[PDB]
Amino acid sequence: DDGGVVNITYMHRLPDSEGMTLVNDIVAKWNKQHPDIQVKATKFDGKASDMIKKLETDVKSGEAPDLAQVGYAELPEVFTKGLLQDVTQYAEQYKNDFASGPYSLVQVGGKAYGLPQDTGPLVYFYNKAEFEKLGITEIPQTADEFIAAAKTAAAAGKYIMSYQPDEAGNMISGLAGASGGWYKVKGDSWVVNTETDGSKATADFYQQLLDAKAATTNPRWDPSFDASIKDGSLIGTVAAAWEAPLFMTSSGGTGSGEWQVAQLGDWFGNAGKTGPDGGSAVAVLKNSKHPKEAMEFLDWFNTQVPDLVSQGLVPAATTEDAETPSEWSTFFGGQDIMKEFKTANNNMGDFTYMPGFSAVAAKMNETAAKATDGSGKVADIFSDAQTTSVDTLKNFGLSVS
Numbered sequence: 405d406d407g408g409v410v411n412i413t414y415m416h417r418l419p420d421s422e423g424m425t426l427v428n429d430i431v432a433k434w435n436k437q438h439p440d441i442q443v444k445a446t447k448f449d450g451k452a453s454d455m456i457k458k459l460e461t462d463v464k465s466g467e468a469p470d471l472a473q474v475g476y477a478e479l480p481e482v483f484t485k486g487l488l489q490d491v492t493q494y495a496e497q498y499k500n501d502f503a504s505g506p507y508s509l510v511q512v513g514g515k516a517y518g519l520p521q522d523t524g525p526l527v528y529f530y531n532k533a534e535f536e537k538l539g540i541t542e543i544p545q546t547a548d549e550f551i552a553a554a555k556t557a558a559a560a561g562k563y564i565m566s567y568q569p570d571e572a573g574n575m576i577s578g579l580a581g582a583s584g585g586w587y588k589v590k591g592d593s594w595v596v597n598t599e600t601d602g603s604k605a606t607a608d609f610y611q612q613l614l615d616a617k618a619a620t621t622n623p624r625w626d627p628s629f630d631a632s633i634k635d636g637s638l639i640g641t642v643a644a645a646w647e648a649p650l651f652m653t654s655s656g657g658t659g660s661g662e663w664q665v666a667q668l669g670d671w672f673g674n675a676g677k678t679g680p681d682g683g684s685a686v687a688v689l690k691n692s693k694h695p696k697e698a699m700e701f702l703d704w705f706n707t708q709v710p711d712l713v714s715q716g717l718v719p720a721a722t723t724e725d726a727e728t729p730s731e732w733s734t735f736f737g738g739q740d741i742m743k744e745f746k747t748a749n750n751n752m753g754d755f756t757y758m759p760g761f762s763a764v765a766a767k768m769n770e771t772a773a774k775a776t777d778g779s780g781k782v783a784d785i786f787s788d789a790q791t792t793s794v795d796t797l798k799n800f801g802l803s804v805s
């Protein structure tokens with residue numbers, strides 16, 4: 405048996421903003437109850453996509469935490485780099501606490517490497533009051549009807565869409581992937597096709613918007629993006645569901661009481677489906693000496709539903725219903741937005757991510773930014789991703805058809 409006190413470290417990249425139940429305050433509850441398993445949680449200092457590079461540095465060092473946040477999209481990559489610990493015999497005990505889809509996303513080859521934490525269905529945020537002022541009385545459901553509406557808004561200095569070049573890897577992959585995967589294993593080899601009907605539909609949608617000057621082009625994480633919500637010019641956009649409290653903070657309050665969440669329209673060849681953008685597991689890393697207790701704490705952590713929801717998460721836990729915080733429904737015109745997130749989740753297409761997808765995402769972002777001044781086409785996002793996907797798999801020493 406272990407000694408009396410086991411010490412566990414947990415690195416996460418949860419927002420921890422004002423108004424939220426801070427992770428350390430969540431962990432303090434556990435620590436008080438469990439002197440036998442003491443937990444130290446720390447928030448990664450840096451840009452989200454850099455976290456797994458730090459984990460890689462730290463695994464090789466032997467200064468890694470026991471537990472770290474790992475995106476579903478990042479799991480096959482960090483797995484392939486040998487950063488994870490097979491914890492199947494422990495995962496199996498907690499399996500029933502979690503929805504079956506997210507639980508399958510912590511597995512590689514029928515072994516489990518942690519526990520799912522949340523999901524990232526793409527939805528549409530919009531200011532309903534501002535739509536009304538523009539005579540937009542319905543969320544337009546076809547790409548053509550949306551583009552027509554967006555030109556009308558644009559001529560009044562308003563935008564019902566944003567193009568986010570720094571998020572093309574995560575958001576635009578999800579939107580295209582809503583209608584079919586880009587990657588599959590066929591026997592001995594990966595088969596890559598990132599130029600699906602969905603990719604073509606998605607490209608055409610954003611291309612028409614950009615050519616009409618009818619979408620903002622501020623990078624999502626730049627102060628210019630918050631400025632667009634604050635100044636009232638950005639009145640509609642695709643968003644991952646976990647964006648809700650972020651968006652609310654970014655706004656400064658502008659539109660409070662008027663914002664609403666809708667399902668994505670059929671704008672991306674998505675035909676009634678949505679796609680994933682983010683959503684993460686927490687993984688047990690290669691050389692953790694305490695997998696059992698790490699997983700014991702993690703099952704507790706990932707079932708603190710109201711506290712996770714405070715961080716904007718759509719929890720993977722099925723142990724209790726997630727509920728819209730009062731603050732959020734207020735901001736969103738009294739709407740129970742969590743019901744929208746759950747609907748979106750249930751309509752979210754599966755998407756296998758190749759190992760090395762970080763490189764595909766990084767390239768997508770780079771090529772996405774070329775489109776904002778007309779130097780590049782939106783479509784080039786998908787043709788470049790195809791080449792980077794194939795090259796990255798080959799760099800990993802993996803076979804590609």
Ligand SMILES: CC(=O)N[C@@H]1[C@@H](O[C@@H]2O[C@H](CO)[C@H](O)[C@H](O)[C@H]2O)[C@@H](O)[C@@H](CO)O[C@H]1O
Pocket residue numbers: 417418419452453475522523524574646650681682683684715716717
């Ligand atoms: C795919 C990805 O990593 N996207 C980044 C965001 O990550 C999401 O974060 C929320 C927490 O707010 C949640 O953990 C979700 O599972 C994640 O996918 C996020 O860090 C964002 C900055 O707020 O940047 C995105 O790039």
Ligand SMILES: [Zn+2]
Pocket residue numbers: 437438439440441
């Ligand atoms: Zn205890």
Ligand SMILES: [Zn+2]
Pocket residue numbers: 406410693694695696697
């Ligand atoms: Zn132990």
